[PDB]
RNA sequence: UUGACCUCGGAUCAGGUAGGAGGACCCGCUGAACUUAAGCAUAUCAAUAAGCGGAGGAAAAGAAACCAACAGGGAUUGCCCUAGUAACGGCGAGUGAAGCGGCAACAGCUCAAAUUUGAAAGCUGGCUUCGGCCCGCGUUGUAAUUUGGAGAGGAUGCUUUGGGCGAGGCUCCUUCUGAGUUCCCUGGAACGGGACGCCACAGAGGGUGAGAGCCCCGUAUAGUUGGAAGCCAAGCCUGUGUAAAGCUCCUUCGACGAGUCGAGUAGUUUGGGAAUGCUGCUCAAAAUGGGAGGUAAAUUUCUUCUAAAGCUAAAUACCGGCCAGAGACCGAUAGCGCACAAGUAGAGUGAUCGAAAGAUGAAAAGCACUUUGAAAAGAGGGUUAAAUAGCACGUGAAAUUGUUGAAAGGGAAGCGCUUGUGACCAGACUUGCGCCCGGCGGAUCAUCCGGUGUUCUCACCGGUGCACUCCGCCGGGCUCAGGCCAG
RNA sequence: GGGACCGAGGACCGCGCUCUGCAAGGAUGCUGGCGUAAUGGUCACCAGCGACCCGUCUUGAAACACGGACCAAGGAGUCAAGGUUUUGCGCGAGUGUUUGGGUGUAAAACCCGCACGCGUAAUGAAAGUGAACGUAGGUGAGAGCUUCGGCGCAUCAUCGACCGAUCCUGAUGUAUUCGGAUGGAUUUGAGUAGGAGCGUUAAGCCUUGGACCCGAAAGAUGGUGAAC
RNA sequence: UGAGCCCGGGUCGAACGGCCUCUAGUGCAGAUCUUGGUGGUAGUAGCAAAU
RNA sequence: AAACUUUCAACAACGGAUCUCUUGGUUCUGGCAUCGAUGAAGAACGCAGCGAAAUGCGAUAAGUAAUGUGAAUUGCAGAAUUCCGUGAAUCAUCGAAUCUUUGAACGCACAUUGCGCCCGCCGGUAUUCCGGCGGGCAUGCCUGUUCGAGCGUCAUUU
């Protein structure tokens, strides 16, 4: 278990951090996985997510719908994703809430830096892979 | 005994293996520092004073200018290869002038002195 | 309290300190001791491995198995017995086993630079003239006043001739 | 805490007027106005005893004990039936002592934790480490807001020696759930006896065993105790010829018969 | 007339410094009372509480005018023990140490007393081209040497050096580093059950629509990117000056703290009239000196240290500051007064006193629209798994109240034993074995064959059959046994 | 002869008798009824009989008096240090690791080098002295064992023995002012006379701490304000 | 016997229990007890400060 | 018989008890040493589009610089603000700045946004007038610089 003394257990101070933290690291908690062929053509189990990512749903009432994320809504850990609306008392649609690790990602919106992330957490993978293989 | 306020005079040993894990750590830091050389310096062989326990022998604070001077360590090289001095006592006795002579010597025969730089 | 309320309540970021402490519980260099040090040894057992005495003191308590850190006359006198006026005092002339015990005897044993002191250029040039003038008596050379202001003796003005090299 | 409940002003109202003779606040601008204080029998007033630091928490219990009762705690785990008395479910090992090679528990070959459970399942501790993985369960109580959350079964403890068996098997046991590890020249009486239920299941090695012996013998101030009795069979005792031939005739029957 | 030297002042001259705060721990001053003594006054409380002044991360103390009577110890500090001993006491209440010993830590020094006198060799300021030029301080004494278990001076012959760079290393922040969202059911949702797997030096914790090692952050070890500041440091360049330093020896020297010790006396304090220590007043020292001890040993013999100047890390305390980790703690009348607008709302002229108050739902999806009507209000209708979950919202007791229904009530009710009437509710032994026929199928049946595991003599399978044996299933046939209550 | 209440136990054993079994150490045999209801439960009411409202406090007793509008939650012999009795446990004339040091999977567990605490010899005011004449004594009981001849635990009573101290008795001898030998005493001890203690747990009691909970007037310390 | 325990029916939505021990802030009708809520008096007294 | 009163059942009110939960409290332990005249603790006034409360900030005012991360804010309004970018953010770090009136509080007064004196500037008829702005002006003490006083005191005809 935890030997690090800088790491707590206490599900207090954990819980206070989760729902107290900044946005960056509300980013780092609403990382998402990546698809089959992303895991194979990327050596990346997860990143952190963003506006112009294609995902599909695995988990909730609306399993298996797929659709580009519309927004990002940091303060309350949740996102939007086109399509996937519900319609109100006045019908007005309000798009229904989703979690990062319910969905899972199927295209990314490559730039610079999404290249240097996944090239960072791709060479460490087969760093160590050779480091524990030989 | 409790006329006073013991309430507010009472303080506990919880501290007690934070203590003991504290002064590890402390001994440790200074072997690192001093990391060839030993921890503590070498003390000479001192007698109790009182009558109730003459027969029996303890460490002193440091050894005799005499003493010092028959096993041939300078007085001024001697805290620098880690030998306590202590300018207050005397001998008195050829008896502990011996003994002394003797454990400094087998310091000598025990030690290794780099030279300098 | 107040305050730790205070900090409670503001928006401001809690200054999370590092754990920094003022000895290093561990030795570093690139030394024999260093280089063989364990991290994960304590003390005792590191000096058995590298076979040095830790505590020179009484042992306060029970210690590891086998660990080995912790430690005719006419005039009588002892001191005869116990013998192998001017001492030399800037060092002491001294006469199957761990490696680094062995390294640290090697790294003693070696020999060192000499660095030998010199003479200034006007002490060369002074004994040159002493020597020049008054030959090679020690006598004279003292006896001399314009020559030898310093009225050094007959013995110093001959060590220094010696270590010059010049007789 | 020390001020918690008279960190207050109160004053007693006295045999003035006709109200409980308590301490009551002073002032006559809020609700708290005019209520008890410094009672135990008041709202928000200090408790009956507070609790304090000074209360005896550790006790000393003597060396002597504590070893005869860590040699008793071994003699059950040697005892076959006290592993299931102290519901380890040992069914399927050959040997209830199970002393396993050092060779093979020895150097890298355990370290790896897929090479201890394989090691486990083939000497059988499988069906008890599958007993504390599907026990892992739920604590009922606020140990679960105090940190407590979740309770299981004990394992198997694996004995070795770190000066001929080493420290790896040490990691290698500690990721496994419900299966602890101890030094040989550190044995524990909290993990050999649970709960204070003799019949802990130890996993043994043919080092431990040569240095349980070298440890007991090397104990200073203590020896093996003998025992009040030799032979432990009442059974043996009771029903032997030399007492069954000097018992004199019996006067009855187990079950006598009622007369009027 | 002039110019000094000394002293005293001014300048909105130049450079700095002191306030206040905090005060948990620390160093001093000052300083009670309640209580106990079953009354109370000495005493105790207490050298405490309040008040005043002053620092730091520790402070303070600290290298003997010590302990001791030793076969000696050897700065200070903290623990255990000494010890409830000694000692003191309205000898009542009570008070109450210390040496020694085991430990933790351990580090020693700077001055005044000297003539550098063959050379004030020392230091402040402003002016700088930053290299060296002045001014001033100062001889009523700044450098070097020296500080009494020492030293100086000569002779003497051995042995030591000093600076500047500095790769790289350690400390700490940071980047990255394992494995199922596979199939079926339940469900609003799977993190639940079942089946099949994987990882693990990682099965701590938290989030995600319900108990998630493998969905996610993190978690473990070894690494790896970049950066900050301290310390260390392999090595590489300069040294230079008849410069410093340690010793040995001796027909040469060896200065050591004053209204301070001490005596008398008042107060305070302590276990301590050799006044326990200190303060105030009067007098007032010594140099084979002074202090404190030992001792009847025969006279103050003997022992051990140098007071009136100063510095100093570590072991030690810590309700305070910056953090961090934990608990056999409390769980919204509890836990801090404050889980939330909490020193807030509020009261008092003022010092001060000081509360009450958490939970919709997974997600507001927070009730569109129609229709009553003056409202914190309804009837439809809709959202949700559920709205008698509707911002009066997790569940929703009792006290108290209303409607409906039943019964009862001639100046008390309520309770006990025993029926009766009415109302509502429940539902008795769980209700089977055995024998005999005819058929059918399986098997410790077969001295049947083959295989596997084993306690090596016991099991379990695969394959033939029904001659015998045993089981069942079917269709007949007969018997028996039963729970309670009455006569 | 008529009537009432009950059937306790559950193979045999025993005592017996009127002996092919019986009324003899305890009920069986036969028949019938029982599921749209045998038998029950709660509530309400009526009916016979009984029946002061609780706690506290005082008194020989009552009688007074104190508290009670109701319901929910809170609510009172607790914790330390020092003594003491008893139970269990470990060791045992020794006992106690946990001041500390070593170690560790790290407030855990394991380990122990030197001390220290109490005890294992006492008495006297003190100098100091210092526990065997007898199987550590006898006699008589005494649990128990026994070759039945006798051995005898613990403990008690008596007669003994010794030690410290006190009052004597006053040896060789002595430095000529020192000594205690021997034999005594209706003596004294918290003495010897073949050790029981140390640690720990559980309960009980005592003292002081807030001390089971609640409840004076007062006194002192430091501040705020006005006034006859 | 009793303090209490088990089940049936309704509601309800996330944790809980039996036994062996260990621990304690462990069992209420009173204390003119504390807090909170709610009654008769009473739709009465009286329109009084507050509201 | 109704009304009223009493008991019970169903249902509905009141109320917040019980179970559950906890970004809280309490206790213990470990690492480090850091307020102020270069203006401290504290008080006040302002700064947002909609700001009540709380927080942040100080006329550069929910703040600026620089670095790092890498595509948001979010209750509503909003950008032609920014997406292979010196680049969003109610982001993190944080070495650079701004820092209103008070307060040890410092030109005098303090209950006035009042009253002063020295140096410089600005605009409006402007060498004169007015208003504003910048730099300043506390005390005790230390060192240095300068000035002054004193028959205190020394001399000075070679």
């Known amino acids: 278990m935890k030997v690090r003394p800088t790491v707590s257990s206490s599900r207090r101070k954990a819980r206070k951090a989760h729902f107290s933290a900044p946005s960056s690291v509300r980013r780092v908690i609403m990382s ?58 006045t019908g007005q649609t309000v798009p229904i809430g989703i979690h990062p690790s319910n969905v899972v990602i199927t295209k990314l919106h490559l730039d610079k830096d999404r290249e240097n992330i996944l090239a960072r957490i791709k060479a460490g993978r087969e760093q160590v892979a050779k480091a524990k293989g030989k | 005994h409790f006329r006073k306020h013991w309430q507010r005079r009472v303080r506990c ?105 | 309290r107040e305050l730790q309320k205070r900090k409670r309540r503001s ?67 002892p ?28 790294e003693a044993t070696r020999p060192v630079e000499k660095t030998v002191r010199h003479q200034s ?47 | 805490s020390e001020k918690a409940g008279h960190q207050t002003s109160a004053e007693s109202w006295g045999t003035g007027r006709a109200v409980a003779r308590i301490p009551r606040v002073s002032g006559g601008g809020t609700h708290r106005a005019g209520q008890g ?41 040697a005892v076959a039936p006290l592993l299931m008395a102290r519901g380890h479910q040992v069914s399927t090992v050959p040997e209830v002592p199970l002393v396993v090679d050092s060779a093979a528990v020895a150097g890298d070959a355990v370290a790896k934790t897929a090479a201890a459970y394989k090691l486990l399942k083939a000497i059988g501790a499988g069906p008890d480490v599958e007993k504390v993985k599907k026990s892992k369960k739920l604590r009922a109580g606020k140990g679960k807001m105090r940190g407590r959350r979740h309770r299981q079964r004990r394992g198997p403890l694996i004995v070795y020696s770190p000066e001929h068996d080493g420290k790896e098997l040490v990691k290698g046991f500690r990721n496994i759930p419900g299966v602890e590890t101890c030094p040989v020249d550190a044995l524990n009486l909290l993990q050999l006896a649970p709960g204070g239920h003799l019949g802990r299941f130890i996993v043994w090695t043919s080092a431990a065993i040569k240095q349980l012996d070298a440890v007991y013998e090397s104990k200073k101030g203590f020896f093996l105790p003998a025992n009040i009795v030799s032979q432990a069979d009442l059974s043996r005792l009771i029903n032997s010829t030399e007492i069954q031939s000097v018992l004199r005739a019996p006067k009855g029957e187990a079950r006598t018969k009622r007369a009027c």
């Open chain 4, 37 to 77: 204080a410094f009672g135990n029998m008041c709202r928000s007033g200090r408790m009956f005893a507070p609790t304090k630091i000074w209360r005896k928490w550790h006790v000393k219990i003597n060396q002597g004990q504590k070893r005869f009762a860590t040699a008793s705690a071994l003699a059950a785990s």
């Open chain 2, 13 to 117: 040993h919880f501290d007690q293996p934070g203590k003991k894990v504290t002064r590890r750590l402390a001994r440790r830091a200074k072997a690192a520092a001093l990391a060839p050389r030993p921890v503590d310096k070498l003390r000479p062989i001192v007698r109790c004073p009182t009558v109730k326990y003459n027969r029996r022998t303890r460490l002193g604070r440091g050894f005799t200018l005499e003493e010092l001077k028959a096993a041939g360590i300078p007085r001024l090289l001697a805290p620098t290869i880690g030998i306590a001095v202590d300018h207050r006592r005397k001998n008195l006795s050829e008896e502990s002038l011996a003994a002394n002579v003797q454990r400094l010597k087998d310091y000598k025969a025990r030690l290794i002195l780099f030279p300098r730089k």
């Open chain 1, 32 to 89: 998402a996985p990546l698809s089959k062929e992303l895991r194979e053509k990327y050596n990346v189990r997860s990143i952190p997510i963003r506006k112009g990512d294609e995902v599909q749903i695995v988990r909730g009432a609306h399993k298996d719908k797929e659709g580009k994320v519309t927004s990002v809504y940091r303060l309350k850990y949740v996102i939007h994703v086109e399509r996937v609306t519900r319609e109100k008392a």
């Open chain 3, 121 to 167: 250029e006007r002490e060369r040039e002074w004994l040159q003239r002493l020597v020049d003038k008054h030959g090679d008596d020690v006598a004279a050379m003292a006896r001399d006043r314009k020559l030898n202001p310093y009225q050094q003796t007959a013995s110093d003005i001959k060590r220094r001739l010696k270590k010059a090299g010049l007789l």
């Open chain 3, 11 to 77: 928006s401001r970021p809690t200054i999370r300190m590092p754990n920094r402490r003022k000895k290093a519980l561990n030795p570093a260099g690139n030394n024999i001791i260093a280089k063989s040090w364990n991290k994960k040894e304590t003390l005792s057992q590191n000096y058995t491995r590298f076979g040095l005495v830790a505590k020179l003191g009484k042992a306060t308590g029970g210690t590891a198995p086998g660990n080995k850190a912790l430690l005719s006359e006419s005039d009588a006198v």
């Open chain 3, 79 to 106: 001191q005869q017995q116990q013998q192998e006026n001017h001492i030399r005092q800037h060092d002491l002339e001294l006469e199957s086993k761990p490696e680094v015990l062995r390294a640290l005897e090697r």
